[PDB]
Subunit: 307 residues, 5 copies
């Protein structure tokens, strides 16, 4: 089995797509292995760029195809080069930009943590092995972060392993395992923007909704309720059109639903107070003054959104 | 006729497009057939990757083109390889990502079920036949699902058949049938998000609209109606800009229309009560108090949205 | 002049773009012509796929380039094949997906009818002629239609003709005409969704706007007017963001404008009634009760939106 | 210097992008020049299509590369052909679709006029010259225009000239000028849609805002103002989300700002009237009745939006 | 080491993407170096365009690959040419359009300044060196700017340097440095549109919100507050849907939040005044008349948004 060592340089992780559970990675891949020594002009190692590589392959040079297992679509590869040493070293180097897939749980939004992973297997050869993996994510830890969407826990962790393909015929009858490199990079979301521009105002609006009980008239209370209703709707719209699309509810989504519920409960009480009596317009004294029952009865059912 | 057996590995089904009735599929395809025995270096089977395959084809190697019948646009193929055994086996393997078409009925939205299908025929050869089909959809059944938009029934069903092309001249005068593989994967939509973030609040807002009848003044009742009207409009906007585009109405779309209707009927009654009398401001006693006629007269016409 | 007969199979028409006046078509093209008889392995006709075709062309095979006149950008062609008969028949077959252009009048929206056309000319040869055209639009007529956005009149009509290029130098000094095939498919839009989800509610909202005249106070009437105003704006927004972009007004656009007009006229009257008198608050009796003048004076100016 | 004459056929101008100041053009380019006479099969001129052209170039055929100076990105070229006459004429013909750039001033929106230009220079040869330019924009003038977004002044103007590249080393030490063709097509925007669907209603809404002064109470006047405020905001949103993005204000943008200003001035007056007196609720008689001061004081400051 | 001098002509900088921190650049690159003298037809330098270049490379011509370090994805290259002088000069020239990345701080929005940078390194050769850099950004300084989104300081600055790659094996054991050209162009954003169309109206709206304190009734003051609330929400939506997406708050974003806060504080006061007394409806005289406390207490906390 040929020993292949790869180093992966990661230049940029960007463009997360919540719906597709993908993210873009720009970087270089280097792969090295040793073969039969070779005669090279002078006795300096030889450099072969781009279109020239295929020529060498036609005349017999072995350059194994390494696949990104979890890439979605053919990656965009830029320049590639072979460095051919006379003593038989062969070093493959290429620039790449790809869309990579992973399981991504966005349920604890603004405060979610994800891992960006790369998975590398040789495409055709079970009979050749990854000797070691080195990722150089030489961005940086504590620096520009409040300029960036994602904060890296860093540096990346690696794992060479063996994957069994049971339904894939192979060269020999016994050997059906592939060598796989797996790189993982952990990251937390920069929750600032969403706290200050979404969660805060949502709170303010929800709170202010409670000030309905400090209105004197029943007519005033009920009528104003419908305007608070409209406000939550506008806010849900705003919230939904600007936040990332998902197939499930986030914490912000729940707050919105709570807002709706509070305002509906209010409309129930407000109407109840006015007709739970013994005359016509005897608003239930104590009740119409649950100007403290709601706010904290909601901060109770609001501390069970975190259980 | 040459016997070709194919296995399809499905990695990912994503990116449904409701308007185009398409969906994206990432996977591998493997196709095997036996030909004339061959001399191979050593006597180990031979591996041929990517650009090298065309070379073998020019020197006479037969590699039939298999077409995805229901793909929309040329699929993006990654690496491909031929594995050439000395005893004449030939195995073709390629990575692919394509947009596939199928008839898709989204009428019973949030609760719709679809089938993602693949259809494979040889492009030029009627005179070669699919021996068997195996799909390995080794994602998984009951696991991550609430993380995913679609839930798979699984595993996929297969079916080799013969398709007659009556208006397509062929090699011989009699033979105009093509061998076709058809893969089907069933799936139900994860209805959670839409229940809690759309259907529920729509309900609340529709209900609350009913509380118009508990207002004392006619002036209060009619004027408030126009605000409920605006609310349903905002809600329709929100609902439309965020839900999948379709050429027909979904259940949610109907709820919205009901909301509009209820609010219009109300404005009719409210105005009727005020002028069906014998004076000037004698609001029809019994009627203005259909605070229960509407809510259940609507839950009646609301159980005929399901007949 | 060489006789070429072409058949066009149409798999899918989709993705209309109103602004660009384009639409996408997926299908196969087949083109047949006879040349000098040929020696073929065995004496069976010979099949040549994809990359192999250019090889045959380099060695002298004539394969005329047929251009889609009204395609916008290079079409995406999938597999292509030549079938070479020993008696000299040559059949070219290719899968294609392309964006096609045509004049498209969307003025009578939801109820518009369009024709999807293809136009085929040889690219370089005036000196070769289309013998006949067959389109197999074997979708189907009355079937799935309420699942589809467009309903086909069907089947397609065809048209071979000759086009004169006066400013294009040609092989000989006299001959400057090209053989053109033109396929036409008629289609009507599925107007359901827009009737029930846009036109209907617009109507309700417009009607409800009229109920402003059944308000007792002048203050009540004028103030409520501004809310109806806001409602039409919200509705216009909703309508515009969701309906297809056009450089002109559709029927729905006009309804919206009417809505605006009605509500402005009402604000004029409402203010007039209050100051066309002889005191201070003597609302012109008869006028403030044009609760029937408007509704039908609008259904009059609403039956001149169709003259 | 070789004399090259080019004709450009323009099929379609579409897809203007206001932000990028680009537009799409689909057409054919033809370029003709004479070289050394040649032996051709028969003695008929010879036709060479697509992949075959490169072959001729390898064997020595000269085909100069003509660059679209103001294209943004590599244009999409369809079929291309060489027509080789035995007397040495050589005619190059290719289909093209490209994104072209020009300075574009959208300041006088709905009523802006633009020019769509093409600029052609040889890529490498200063030492070869454009003899003449003919554009065949055989669309048409007064015909379908209300179906189209842009109206062409027509026909296009042309202008061969010489461009000096001072910082570009050339074949000889003296010669650093390139032959450039420049095509210009003038066009005016079809202002209908924007007049009837944006400018008109904006007017109505602005006018109606003035009817605030015909309200009896101060409370009524101030409170209603805030609703007019909200309306202008909704309208700005609607206007912005639907109109073309620009880095500057259009006339419509200014109207919107005026609307905002009028409504703010009103709020100032309304509050002033109520407290510029000598008691408590003595609304300044004359002032509260500037129901004509505003409307025309605005049509004054509204005729200085056009100075 | 081979001396390579490059000139970069910049035609267009456009398409900034705030989320990705990228921008598009269209231009030409020219690279020159001297090699072994050569026999050329006549003794005029020789021009080699496009596909022909690879041919010369197969026959031994050395054309080093220059990589844009900070491009994102393979740039779109148009025409390329080699100019081969007989005395051994070699000049490579290519048109390019690429998406480039840089650190981009948009925190001080409408008034941010950015630098558009290019970074060039040889892809494989450490053993070859950039002798000098010239950028010809011959757009222009003070001219069309109010037509353009970005205003260039100009002209660009350059800087050849040496970059150490510690984890990249090289030709010789010692030499692991690459020659890198860095071009920088400074630019300020055209803040007009955002001042007049966003910041201004936001101000007006915020100010008008203060006029709530000039309402007579408590009921009037509280109820009107909820409409001002809704207005800020609509405005936030409008602002968010139209302004560039970012992972952090801009100045505009902060104004919005202030608006929310002012309105909430008002609701607190308004309710406080009404219940900080000694009866039932004794609105705290002095307080309810903080019609000047707020406006300047906000212009105070509004001059600490700039500390
Ligand atoms: C299932 C299958 O086709 O795998 C091929 C690619 N490989 C071995 C790298 C995963
Ligand atoms: C209609 C037509 O061209 O079919 C050719 C390809 N085939 C037989 C695989 C569908
Ligand atoms: C105008 C022009 O160049 O037309 C050539 C292609 N043709 C004849 C198929 C339309
Ligand atoms: C600056 C530069 O590279 O120009 C080359 C192309 N030309 C001469 C057609 C503009
Ligand atoms: C890290 C790496 O792969 O660099 C290769 C390209 N280079 C040397 C020009 C930066």
């Amino acid at each position: 089995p040929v020993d292949v060592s790869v180093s992966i340089f990661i230049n940029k992780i960007y463009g997360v797509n919540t719906l597709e559970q993908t993210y873009k990675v720009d970087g270089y891949i280097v792969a090295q292995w040793t073969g039969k020594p070779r005669k090279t002009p002078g006795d300096k190692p030889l450099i072969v760029e781009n279109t020239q590589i295929e020529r060498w392959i036609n005349n017999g040079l072995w350059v194994p195809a390494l696949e990104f297992i979890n890439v979605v679509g053919s990656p965009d590869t830029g320049n590639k080069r072979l460095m051919l040493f006379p003593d038989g070293r062969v070093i493959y180097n290429a620039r790449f930009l790809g869309s990579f897939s992973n399981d991504m749980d966005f349920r604890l939004f603004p405060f979610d943590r994800q891992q960006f992973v790369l998975e590398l297997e040789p495409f055709s050869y079970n009979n050749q092995q990854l000797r070691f993996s080195d990722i150089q994510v030489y961005t940086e830890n504590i620096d520009n972060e409040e300029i960036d969407e994602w904060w890296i826990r860093g540096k990346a962790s690696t794992h060479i392993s063996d994957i069994r393909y049971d339904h894939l015929s192979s060269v020999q009858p016994n050997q059906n395992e592939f060598s796989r490199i797996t790189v993982r990079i952990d990251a937390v979301r920069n929750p600032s923007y969403y706290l200050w521009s979404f969660i805060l105002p949502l709170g303010l609006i929800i709170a202010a909704s409670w000030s309905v009980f400090w209105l004197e008239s029943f007519s005033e209370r009920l009528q104003t309720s419908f305007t608070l209703m409209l406000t939550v709707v506008a806010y849900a719209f705003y919230t939904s059109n600007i936040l990332p699309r998902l197939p499930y509810t986030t914490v912000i989504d729940q707050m919105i639903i709570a807002g709706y519920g509070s305002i509906f409960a209010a409309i129930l009480l407000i109407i109840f107070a006015h007709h739970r009596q013994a005359n016509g317009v005897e608003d239930d004294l104590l009740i119409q003054r649950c100007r403290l029952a709601f706010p904290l009865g909601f901060l109770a059912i609001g501390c069970v959104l975190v259980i």
